[PDB]
Design an enzyme around this catalytic site. Structure first.
Site, PDB file in Angstrom:
ATOM      1  N   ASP A   1      42.684 -10.231  24.993  1.00 24.74           N
ATOM      2  CA  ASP A   1      42.727 -10.281  26.458  1.00 24.74           C
ATOM      3  C   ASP A   1      42.116  -9.029  27.108  1.00 24.74           C
ATOM      4  O   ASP A   1      42.582  -7.909  26.874  1.00 24.74           O
ATOM      5  CB  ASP A   1      44.149 -10.485  26.989  1.00 24.74           C
ATOM      6  CG  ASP A   1      44.164 -10.692  28.513  1.00 24.74           C
ATOM      7  OD1 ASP A   1      43.807 -11.805  28.961  1.00 24.74           O
ATOM      8  OD2 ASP A   1      44.507  -9.751  29.259  1.00 24.74           O
TER       9      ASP A   1
ATOM     10  N   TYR B   1      40.049  -2.955  33.632  1.00 29.12           N
ATOM     11  CA  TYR B   1      40.728  -2.092  32.648  1.00 29.12           C
ATOM     12  C   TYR B   1      39.839  -0.921  32.214  1.00 29.12           C
ATOM     13  O   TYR B   1      40.309   0.033  31.577  1.00 29.12           O
ATOM     14  CB  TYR B   1      41.164  -2.888  31.412  1.00 29.12           C
ATOM     15  CG  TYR B   1      42.130  -4.027  31.680  1.00 29.12           C
ATOM     16  CD1 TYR B   1      42.854  -4.098  32.867  1.00 29.12           C
ATOM     17  CD2 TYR B   1      42.319  -5.033  30.739  1.00 29.12           C
ATOM     18  CE1 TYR B   1      43.734  -5.160  33.109  1.00 29.12           C
ATOM     19  CE2 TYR B   1      43.195  -6.096  30.973  1.00 29.12           C
ATOM     20  CZ  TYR B   1      43.900  -6.151  32.159  1.00 29.12           C
ATOM     21  OH  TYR B   1      44.764  -7.210  32.396  1.00 29.12           O
TER      22      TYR B   1
ATOM     23  N   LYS C   1      38.440 -11.297  33.018  1.00 27.20           N
ATOM     24  CA  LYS C   1      38.937 -11.616  34.347  1.00 27.20           C
ATOM     25  C   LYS C   1      38.014 -11.068  35.429  1.00 27.20           C
ATOM     26  O   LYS C   1      37.552  -9.939  35.326  1.00 27.20           O
ATOM     27  CB  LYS C   1      40.340 -11.017  34.520  1.00 27.20           C
ATOM     28  CG  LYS C   1      41.305 -11.376  33.386  1.00 27.20           C
ATOM     29  CD  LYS C   1      42.749 -10.995  33.688  1.00 27.20           C
ATOM     30  CE  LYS C   1      43.574 -11.002  32.409  1.00 27.20           C
ATOM     31  NZ  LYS C   1      43.357  -9.777  31.566  1.00 27.20           N
TER      32      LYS C   1
ATOM     33  N   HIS D   1      41.264 -12.882  38.502  1.00 25.58           N
ATOM     34  CA  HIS D   1      42.310 -11.916  38.161  1.00 25.58           C
ATOM     35  C   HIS D   1      43.510 -11.956  39.116  1.00 25.58           C
ATOM     36  O   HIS D   1      44.662 -11.911  38.663  1.00 25.58           O
ATOM     37  CB  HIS D   1      41.718 -10.508  38.088  1.00 25.58           C
ATOM     38  CG  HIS D   1      42.495  -9.565  37.218  1.00 25.58           C
ATOM     39  ND1 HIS D   1      41.890  -8.572  36.479  1.00 25.58           N
ATOM     40  CD2 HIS D   1      43.827  -9.455  36.982  1.00 25.58           C
ATOM     41  CE1 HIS D   1      42.815  -7.892  35.818  1.00 25.58           C
ATOM     42  NE2 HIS D   1      43.997  -8.410  36.102  1.00 25.58           N
TER      43      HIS D   1
HETATM   44  N1  LIG Z   1      46.661 -10.781  34.495  1.00 21.78           N
HETATM   45  C1  LIG Z   1      47.284  -9.685  34.914  1.00 21.78           C
HETATM   46  O1  LIG Z   1      47.368  -9.401  36.107  1.00 21.78           O
HETATM   47  C2  LIG Z   1      47.948  -8.831  33.867  1.00 21.78           C
HETATM   48  C3  LIG Z   1      48.912  -7.902  34.232  1.00 21.78           C
HETATM   49  C4  LIG Z   1      49.525  -7.146  33.236  1.00 21.78           C
HETATM   50  C5  LIG Z   1      49.147  -7.354  31.907  1.00 21.78           C
HETATM   51  N2  LIG Z   1      48.202  -8.253  31.563  1.00 21.78           N
HETATM   52  C6  LIG Z   1      47.801  -8.436  30.147  1.00 21.78           C
HETATM   53  O2  LIG Z   1      48.932  -8.530  29.267  1.00 21.78           O
HETATM   54  C7  LIG Z   1      48.871  -7.511  28.270  1.00 21.78           C
HETATM   55  C8  LIG Z   1      50.266  -7.071  27.814  1.00 21.78           C
HETATM   56  O3  LIG Z   1      51.026  -6.611  28.936  1.00 21.78           O
HETATM   57  P1  LIG Z   1      51.262  -5.032  29.210  1.00 21.78           P
HETATM   58  O4  LIG Z   1      50.121  -4.213  28.656  1.00 21.78           O
HETATM   59  O5  LIG Z   1      51.543  -4.858  30.684  1.00 21.78           O
HETATM   60  O6  LIG Z   1      52.653  -4.626  28.489  1.00 21.78           O
HETATM   61  P2  LIG Z   1      53.418  -5.181  27.181  1.00 21.78           P
HETATM   62  O7  LIG Z   1      52.524  -5.893  26.200  1.00 21.78           O
HETATM   63  O8  LIG Z   1      54.686  -5.843  27.660  1.00 21.78           O
HETATM   64  O9  LIG Z   1      53.901  -3.799  26.506  1.00 21.78           O
HETATM   65  C9  LIG Z   1      52.998  -2.813  26.001  1.00 21.78           C
HETATM   66  C10 LIG Z   1      53.812  -1.562  25.669  1.00 21.78           C
HETATM   67  O10 LIG Z   1      54.743  -1.881  24.629  1.00 21.78           O
HETATM   68  C11 LIG Z   1      54.532  -1.040  23.500  1.00 21.78           C
HETATM   69  N3  LIG Z   1      54.688  -1.827  22.258  1.00 21.78           N
HETATM   70  C12 LIG Z   1      53.879  -2.809  21.831  1.00 21.78           C
HETATM   71  N4  LIG Z   1      54.352  -3.281  20.657  1.00 21.78           N
HETATM   72  C13 LIG Z   1      55.466  -2.590  20.355  1.00 21.78           C
HETATM   73  C14 LIG Z   1      56.363  -2.635  19.294  1.00 21.78           C
HETATM   74  N5  LIG Z   1      56.198  -3.518  18.271  1.00 21.78           N
HETATM   75  N6  LIG Z   1      57.398  -1.775  19.287  1.00 21.78           N
HETATM   76  C15 LIG Z   1      57.578  -0.894  20.283  1.00 21.78           C
HETATM   77  N7  LIG Z   1      56.734  -0.836  21.320  1.00 21.78           N
HETATM   78  C16 LIG Z   1      55.672  -1.675  21.371  1.00 21.78           C
HETATM   79  C17 LIG Z   1      53.117  -0.494  23.641  1.00 21.78           C
HETATM   80  O11 LIG Z   1      53.003   0.790  23.020  1.00 21.78           O
HETATM   81  P3  LIG Z   1      51.671   1.282  22.233  1.00 21.78           P
HETATM   82  O12 LIG Z   1      50.522   0.621  22.940  1.00 21.78           O
HETATM   83  O13 LIG Z   1      51.710   2.783  22.466  1.00 21.78           O
HETATM   84  O14 LIG Z   1      51.870   0.848  20.802  1.00 21.78           O
HETATM   85  C18 LIG Z   1      52.972  -0.414  25.143  1.00 21.78           C
HETATM   86  O15 LIG Z   1      53.586   0.796  25.601  1.00 21.78           O
HETATM   87  C19 LIG Z   1      48.091  -6.414  28.969  1.00 21.78           C
HETATM   88  O16 LIG Z   1      47.620  -5.370  28.108  1.00 21.78           O
HETATM   89  C20 LIG Z   1      47.018  -7.233  29.648  1.00 21.78           C
HETATM   90  O17 LIG Z   1      46.080  -7.662  28.656  1.00 21.78           O
HETATM   91  C21 LIG Z   1      47.609  -8.988  32.522  1.00 21.78           C
HETATM   92  O1  LIG Z   2      46.141  -6.675  34.847  1.00 22.72           O
HETATM   93  C1  LIG Z   2      46.466  -5.702  35.513  1.00 22.72           C
HETATM   94  C2  LIG Z   2      47.000  -5.823  36.925  1.00 22.72           C
HETATM   95  O2  LIG Z   2      45.936  -5.711  37.884  1.00 22.72           O
HETATM   96  C3  LIG Z   2      48.027  -4.700  37.170  1.00 22.72           C
HETATM   97  O3  LIG Z   2      48.541  -4.721  38.518  1.00 22.72           O
END
Ligand SMILES: NC(=O)c1ccc[n+]([C@@H]2O[C@H](COP(=O)([O-])OP(=O)(O)OC[C@H]3O[C@@H](n4cnc5c(N)ncnc54)[C@H](OP(=O)(O)O)[C@@H]3O)[C@@H](O)[C@H]2O)c1
Ligand SMILES: O=C[C@H](O)CO
EC number: 1.1.1.21
Length: 316
Positions: free
Chosen positions: A44, A49, A78, A111
């Site tokens: 993704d 980003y 996106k 997005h």
């Molecule tokens: N469409 C949108 O508007 C939107 C918004 C938000 C997110 N997204 C997408 O969704 C993806 C995931 O969401 P997110 O990045 O917000 O947060 P997330 O996946 O809920 O959490 C990521 C965090 O959790 C930690 N983590 C991951 N695996 C772990 C494990 N096994 N044990 C302990 N900690 C762990 C990571 O640390 P480390 O990285 O330091 O290992 C990082 O700090 C994003 O990267 C993005 O691609 C899209």
């Molecule tokens: O995907 C990332 C979002 O734009 C955070 O607000």
């Protein structure tokens, strides 16, 4: 369960992907390489980003090394808010393709439903601090997205952070040519999203759960904010199954027929996060996890609450 699910374009989408928001440019190349090495097939991405070039280096090397074929990868990006204008959509898509070093995307999402004024700034502000909107109708942005399909730049198109009325607006678009294949929305046990998910699934739109660990590395997190990874109730469920808390949190949306995209740049966690196909949560575990909903939203886009198309004033 099946590792992929069927989209309305006839293509199959891996239900587990690697997220890349907040992955530093100097770590994300190795993160994506490791992910592909351990079996991930779905990445993704987004222009906003600011790391698509580095993600692309990883993908290209794994393609060149023949670790994976292109047909086996499912790459998502996106369209950012400052490119909603019809005449800017193709160029935004082309820039993402160029950075990722691909000739097509498997999925390209709008997005946010909010259009902003085009320019260098991702969040163009007026002198008082409000974000400056675009007058471009979301239905015209959708028509421009449909052109990318017909031009071969993307195999499927979808939306992100659309509320149920905004989703309905697209499904009811006069002359609609391609339905949204996917709506990507925040989803975890503190924001379970039953209403929006059932609506989308009733329409044949596949839901992708983002921030499934509650995005503890989000920049605006407060020290007192809840942590899904440290919730003792989730820890208990994990212990019972001999899995980690992250593995439970990832398996959770999978059993709701959602796609899920946990982000990590830590090679051990990237590997651990993929090992979720060898156990099953009970219906009781699922309902218990669902009971933890607090309507706690981590990506509220607070700076745009005044925008006409801000999606979260509506209940769902
Ligand atoms: N469409 C949108 O508007 C939107 C918004 C938000 C997110 N997204 C997408 O969704 C993806 C995931 O969401 P997110 O990045 O917000 O947060 P997330 O996946 O809920 O959490 C990521 C965090 O959790 C930690 N983590 C991951 N695996 C772990 C494990 N096994 N044990 C302990 N900690 C762990 C990571 O640390 P480390 O990285 O330091 O290992 C990082 O700090 C994003 O990267 C993005 O691609 C899209
Ligand atoms: O995907 C990332 C979002 O734009 C955070 O607000």
């Amino acid at each position: 369960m099946a590792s992929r699910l069927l989209l309305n374009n006839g293509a199959k989408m891996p239900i587990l992907g690697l997220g890349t928001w907040k992955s530093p440019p100097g770590q994300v190349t190795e993160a994506v390489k490791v992910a592909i090495d351990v079996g991930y097939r779905h990445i993704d991405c987004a222009h906003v980003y600011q790391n698509e070039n580095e993600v692309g280096v990883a993908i290209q090397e794994k393609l060149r090394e023949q670790v994976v074929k292109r047909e086996e990868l499912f790459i998502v990006s996106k369209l950012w808010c400052t490119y909603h204008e019809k005449g800017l959509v193709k160029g935004a898509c082309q820039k993402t393709l160029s950075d990722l070093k691909l000739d097509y995307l498997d999925l390209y999402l709008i997005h946010w439903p909010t259009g902003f004024k085009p320019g260098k700034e991702f969040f163009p502000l007026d002198e008082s601090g409000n974000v400056v909107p675009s007058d471009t109708n979301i239905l015209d942005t959708w028509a421009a997205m449909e052109e990318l399909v017909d031009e071969g730049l993307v195999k499927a198109i979808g939306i992100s952070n659309f509320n149920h009325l905004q989703v309905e607006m697209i499904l009811n678009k006069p002359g609609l040519k391609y339905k949204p294949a996917v709506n990507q929305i925040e989803c975890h046990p503190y924001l379970t999203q039953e209403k929006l998910i059932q609506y989308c699934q009733s329409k044949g739109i596949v839901v992708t759960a983002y921030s499934p660990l509650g995005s503890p590395d989000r920049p605006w997190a407060k020290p007192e904010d809840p942590s899904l990874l440290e919730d003792p109730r989730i820890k208990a469920i994990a212990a019972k199954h001999n899995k980690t808390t992250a593995q439970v949190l990832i398996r959770f949306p999978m059993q709701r027929n959602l796609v899920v995209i946990p982000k990590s740049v830590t090679p051990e966690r990237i590997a651990e996060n993929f090992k979720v196909f060898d156990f099953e949560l009970s219906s009781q575990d699922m309902t218990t996890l669902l009971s933890y909903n607090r309507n706690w939203r981590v990506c509220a886009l607070l700076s745009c609450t005044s925008h006409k198309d801000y999606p979260f004033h509506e209940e769902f």
